[PDB]
């Protein structure tokens, strides 16, 4: 798939606002991730013993990884489906280092899309979140296909 570059202005004119802030909306996400898919919160060794939303909320570590996670999404956006290269890396440490279905990084994706649209209404209306969606469909994608190459489910 390609996102022709009116899609992919969308995608980064919201961008732009959650970059405003990453730490605040890393947080959002994780959170929205664990509290709906309580499973995936396992996967993370250093904050699983995490309890609640309130502990969620104070753990230091959980909003560096927010910040880590928003910050490599980001540098694959910007290249605007021009990422072999950013893809590589973090393709092989969730596929063979932390063992990450691709069915948890649909959950992740509805979280980002839930907090963006909670917090940018006005910047993320029914176009720029199609236009979101199908830019993190190409995301999924093409690491599905490069899990495949490296010896990883599918
Ligand atoms: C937008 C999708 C995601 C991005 C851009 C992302 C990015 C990263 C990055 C940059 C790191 C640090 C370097 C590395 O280990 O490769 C990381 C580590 C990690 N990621 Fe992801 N990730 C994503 C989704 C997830 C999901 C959905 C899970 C689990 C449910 C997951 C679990 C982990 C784990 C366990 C680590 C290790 C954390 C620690 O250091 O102990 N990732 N991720």
Redesign the pocket.
Known sequence: MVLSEGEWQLVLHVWAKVEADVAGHGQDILIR?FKSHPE?LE????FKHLKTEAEMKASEDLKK?GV??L???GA?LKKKGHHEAELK??AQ??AT??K?PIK??E???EA?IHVLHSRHPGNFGADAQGAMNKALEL?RKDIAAKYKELGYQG
């Open positions: 991730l995936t996967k993370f060794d250093r990884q880590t996670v910050t490599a999404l694959i890396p973090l440490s969730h280092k932390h990450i948890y990084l959950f992740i994706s980002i995301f």
